[PDB]
Amino acid sequence: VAQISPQYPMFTVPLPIPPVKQPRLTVTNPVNGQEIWYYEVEIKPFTHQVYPDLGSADLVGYDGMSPGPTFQVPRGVETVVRFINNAEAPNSVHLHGSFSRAAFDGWAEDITEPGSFKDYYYPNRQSARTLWYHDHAMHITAENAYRGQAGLYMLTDPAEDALNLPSGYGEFDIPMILTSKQYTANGNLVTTNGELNSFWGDVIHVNGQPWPFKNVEPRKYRFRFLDAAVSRSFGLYFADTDAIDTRLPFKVIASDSGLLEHPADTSLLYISMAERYEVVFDFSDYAGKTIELRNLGGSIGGIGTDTDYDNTDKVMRFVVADDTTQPDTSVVPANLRDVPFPSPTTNTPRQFRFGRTGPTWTINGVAFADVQNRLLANVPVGTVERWELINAGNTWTHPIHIHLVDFKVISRTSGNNARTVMPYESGLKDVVWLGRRETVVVEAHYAPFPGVYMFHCHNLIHEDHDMMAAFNATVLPDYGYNATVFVDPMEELWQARPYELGEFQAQSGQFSVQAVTERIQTMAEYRPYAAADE
Template sequence: MAHSIRSYEVEIKPFTRKQFPNLPPTRQVGYDGMMPGPTFQTMQGREAIVRFINHGDRADSVHLHGSFSRSPFDGWADDATEIGQYKDYYWPNRQNARTLWYHDHVADHTAENVYQGQAGFYILHDTEEMSKGLPSGKYDIPLGIMARSYNPDGSLWSPEAHNEDVSLYGDVIEVNGQPWPFLAVEPRKYRFRLLDLGISRTFILYLQADQQNSKTVPFTIVGSDAGLLQRPVVSEDVTISVAERWDVVIDFSTFAGQNITMRNKRGIAADTDYPATDRVMRFVVGKSVSDNSNNGVVPNPLRQIAFPPNKAVTTRDFTFDLKDEKWVINGVGWHDVSERILATPKRGSIEIWNFHNAGDWSHPVHVHLIDFQVIKRTGSARSVLPYEAAAQQDVVWLGPRETVTIIARFSPWPGLYMFHCHNLIHEDHEMLDAINVTQVQIPGLKETNLFIDPMDPKYRPKSFPPAQLASRSGDFSKQAIQKKVEWFASLNAYADVDEVEAKLEAYWNNKYTKGRRHGRKHQAEYVKRRRALEGLGTVEDDEMMS
């Protein structure tokens, strides 16, 4: 099968940027020396090979968050690219349109790496989303929100240098790496792709009209981690925890010549409030519109979502807790290597998972590989939020003492994948574990390479002489890169995903139907025996099977 593949190269390296007018520039480490890193824009079906070259301060491992990447390219925490090495990541881009992001995921150092700047947007488009008439082009803007702290000399306060093992909430709110920025907008609709970059703070965002007695301005939520919602949801606020994405449409048309301020609520779980952490950014609304395209009514519905049917084969429980000064899931952390695989869902099966929070902290819980549906929340005043009810997600915020229930189909691939708390301080201090999506025999499905091992030597990072990069020779020559692209294409890692998904769904639907029939047959036989013993005669099988 023919492949459409594009090859990219990104260098992890230090850079400096002036964050405050009265302080020296701040040293950071980012993708291609910027924060956020380069924004990828790609179409569904166009695969990507991205070579990340590590010239940073420490090891890295890159995760494309929201992608069903094969296990060796998913950013396994132990698959470390050391300084002076590179790794080629092969990403599918075959899901529906969505806001993804890429970030570091290396064991024990994810928080420091992301905090220093290793994060970037990755936008996947498809023709269905493009046909909806939502704001696009210069009116479609990613906004990555992060809370950081600085030393008096303008340098970043380092969580690792200060042995931070609880949380780093940050007293400076930044958007796309800039403290308390403003954005000039036209008096029309915009789409903003909101992403909480962390590394610990959860936000409840809302808008105020500065020249209208700070009245609250409603907005329309149209997208989540997994793409467009089923229907648009009008809201006056949105809760967004670390790594969550919510796409919103804001209509500035009635605020020409005015300012709109995005603010953050106080008193969220255990998050520490500071004097300025209730402010995020300001929109400065102009007085004229240069382009009225894609400025109409948000369509309803937005798309049809294939929510997992309630045919779960297993229900599992996971407790997130602090024990013996370690953040753990079911008492197990990442370095408990022999115990860290906490679940073995069968490939393509549907499972229900209950996340229990045993403490007064909050935990944004992320499960790799899959999209899931939040179906219940108990233990607090919150239920499933209206926009959650219309969405699929890959992160859910687990508030203090809450239980959140999700349902998901574990597909399309087998192999080892991670799940964890996305408060990156918690993650680095053990609240990171694994699942093993186990293979099932699907009739008619021919696969020669299952990519189940994230540490497969064929795909591990490679060292190289520095001169090769400078001279574009060796592994960095045009011929070598072309050969690598052809080799990846020959693996057929993603091209048959639609067929795989269809056959997995058919297989489990058939097993579910047979299981129900089998159960009804046993129930009928039991009733027959009981009625015979009681002298009540028998009933027909058809009566029990109806």
């Protein structure tokens, strides 16, 4: 249907690459003698001229940019990130794809008010994967993500580096953060505030830029796709501009949780909110061509309900040179890794229905605001469970996400007989798309940390109103590991703390080297991640 946002100069601005975030300090962990990387991120308002010939857009971002800066962290290095709110609304940071302790996971009520900060302690022990960090503040997650609070966090492993996949952040390893927004006639953002169904957006962005282009060489590139949109799901394909309907083959190498067992030969990639898929595209057969990255219409080929607009079939263009300046020394091995699947279980799947209760998006008829009723599952730590995720609706779709865990997709049924499990769903994931009338069974090891964790739809409008609940990964009282201080996301020890802006700007007082060092060493003594050792 007709674009609402102003006409945009399509494919004229280069694809921006978010800069890599550098830690301020390293602190010796007195428990293990290892260095903890300490980072400071300032959440603040800024403006950005998205439309060349109109006014600016008002944004609020990590370090006053959108997307947020990219973290690049090796497995085995613990990090602490001081997320400092210097904005106008509260925040809660979640590292999506990290088995963080409950009080470092971005529990929706575990907020930082403007003029406060929270220290988040991350383990960085899981399989190499594309994580992302984004806002999770109760009721305002959609608008906080939409106005710019999302960034990438790449967990690296030299074992993955030895596969010789296309490499170098911003060279042949390219972040592809997809959003879908709407703009006013003067080039400001249309707010998601007041939307209670879905905010589709009519302007497609990659790394914060509407409809960009990139100059590429005729060789293989790693693309790290993330759907960071509020409500738009995508069916991605690549096409020569000389045959814009003919899909070109590519390989999917990784899902949310890390590498597939084998690359999946693909010409169409379904990706819904919060899904990461890493793709290798080989431009070598397309020297001197223009390859358009496009998006399936028809509400993602009858799987979704998303509105299509005039230009939401277009994502970006790749202008391919006639030859490479350096040899392509990259490869996509037929065997990528042994995926660490959980044990199969014979236990009766739990059932969760994602539907509506009057006007509210609910799980089993419950809204996250309803403290009394929102704790829908108690699961002993170390248990494997199958969850049957049911979308009985034909007029909504729900990408479902479970915190803490990686899961295997066991089965999909479609009441429209549309599809089953996709080949790129063969590995481990943490989001799965319930298309129209879809039921998906996932199987997950509820390990290794006890605590209260969220699961929800990652359509942020649904999530905000109010399609989110909690599970408690439980332990017996003789279980050690300081569990009494790490099970409760609201534990006073880990709460946000007020700061003076001068202190921050001068790196004095509680931002002195002494104060940060004492704080992180005290945190480290509690040994939050010890139960994941080996």
